[PDB]
């Protein structure tokens, strides 16, 4: 039947909200944590200019796999297999050591699709924002430095996708003293 | 002001931080954020609503009544038209309770048809969350009447949408309301 990308955001806004009910945010209020799928995709449509309806989505579900009670067949029924697919590029297994983690999403970086460039450069951006604002329940500001450090090692790999966000992070990486 | 996704998010987001302290009165403290993403996802989903200033309208319409949000804010970000609507559907928070409720009977029927629409929605999606779990310290009584209380709003709003209307039918019929 008839659809409109105006109904298929909602779907991917509802569907994340529900998925993310009970998770919050690490600073100290507690912040929902859908307020960062929802700040992540307002990064792609207000600062980089992106409307692809598939890449929004999957900025809305980008944490769903990883983080909660979501499967990839249940992102291709409701959303199609380009958006399941793009869920499972920037799904990271939540079952190995947090240092593995940190390493695969600098290697798998380069090799990333350009809508997967896109969601991961939000991501990174809105978290890296979120921490200048407030240092996070539990995070050092050792923690927050290395935070940094590495997310510059990641979107090292990611640049030449987004002139915005990459600007943006540049900038931001630039007055902690690192280039990339 | 952009694309249709554009403005959409750019009212989720700013609903979002504006109910970023707030939860339901479910035992689990549902972050409030999901009711007005899912009274807007009723008007796409199930009442084929396309028309993005009911949409925005929908995200924003707690923000004035529960939030530190001025009627300025909301049209500085989102302009006249969605402005008007939210005013339309924003309740007077300093009524006591009871009077609250008379005064959204009293509005119902010269509401415009898109703010009919949002409290359709609105109306809606709440009736389901009692259906679904009982706010914590409610009474059935309480949730009953509730739902007499919806049955005389919702009978102000009839000939707005058929898919909504048919549906909150179902709910109040389920509990013996006739609308
Ligand atoms: N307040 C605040 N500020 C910044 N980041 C926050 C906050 N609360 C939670 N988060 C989420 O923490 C995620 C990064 O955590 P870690 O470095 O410990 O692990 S990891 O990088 O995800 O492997 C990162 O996860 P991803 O979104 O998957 O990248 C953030 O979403
Ligand atoms: N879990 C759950 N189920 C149903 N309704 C819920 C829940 N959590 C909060 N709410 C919000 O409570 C509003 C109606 O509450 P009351 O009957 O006490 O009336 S009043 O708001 O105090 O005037 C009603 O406000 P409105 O959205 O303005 O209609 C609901 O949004
Ligand atoms: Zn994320
Ligand atoms: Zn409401």
Same mark, same amino acid.
């Given at each position: 039947?008839?659809?409109?990308?105006?109904?298929? &955001?909602? /779907?991917?806004?509802?569907?994340?909200?529900?998925?993310?009910?009970?998770?919050?945010? %690490?600073?100290?209020?507690?912040?929902? !944590?859908?307020?960062?799928?929802?700040?992540?995709?307002?990064?792609? @449509? =207000?600062?980089?200019?992106? @409307?692809?309806?598939? $890449?929004?989505?999957?900025?809305?579900? =980008?944490?769903?796999?990883?983080?909660?009670?979501?499967?990839?067949?249940?992102?291709?029924?409701?959303?199609?297999?380009?958006?399941?697919?793009? $869920?499972? /590029?920037?799904?990271?297994?939540?079952?190995?050591? %947090? &240092?593995?983690? %940190?390493?695969?999403?600098?290697?798998?970086?380069?090799?990333?699709?350009?809508?997967?460039?896109?969601?991961? &450069? +939000?991501?990174?951006?809105?978290?890296?924002?979120?921490?200048?604002?407030?240092?996070?329940?539990?995070?050092?500001? =050792?923690?927050?430095? /290395? !935070?940094?450090?590495?997310? +510059?090692? $990641? $979107?090292?790999?990611?640049?030449? @996708?987004?002139?915005?966000?990459? /600007?943006?992070?540049?900038?931001?990486? %630039?007055?902690?003293?690192?280039?990339?």
């Amino acid at each position: 039947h008839m659809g409109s990308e105006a109904a298929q &955001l909602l /779907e991917a806004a509802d569907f994340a909200a529900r998925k993310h009910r009970q998770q919050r945010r %690490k600073d100290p209020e507690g912040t929902p !944590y859908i307020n960062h799928p929802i700040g992540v995709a307002r990064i792609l @449509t =207000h600062e980089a200019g992106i @409307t692809d309806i598939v $890449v929004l989505q999957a900025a809305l579900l =980008h944490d769903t796999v990883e983080k909660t009670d979501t499967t990839l067949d249940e992102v291709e029924l409701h959303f199609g297999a380009q958006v399941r697919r793009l $869920v499972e /590029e920037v799904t990271d297994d939540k079952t190995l050591p %947090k &240092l593995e983690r %940190k390493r695969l999403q600098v290697e798998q970086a380069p090799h990333s699709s350009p809508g997967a460039k896109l969601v991961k &450069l +939000a991501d990174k951006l809105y978290n890296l924002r979120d921490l200048n604002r407030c240092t996070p329940e539990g995070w050092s500001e =050792h923690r927050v430095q /290395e !935070y940094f450090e590495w997310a +510059a090692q $990641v $979107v090292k790999g990611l640049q030449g @996708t987004n002139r915005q966000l990459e /600007e943006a992070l540049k900038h931001l990486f %630039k007055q902690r003293g690192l280039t990339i």
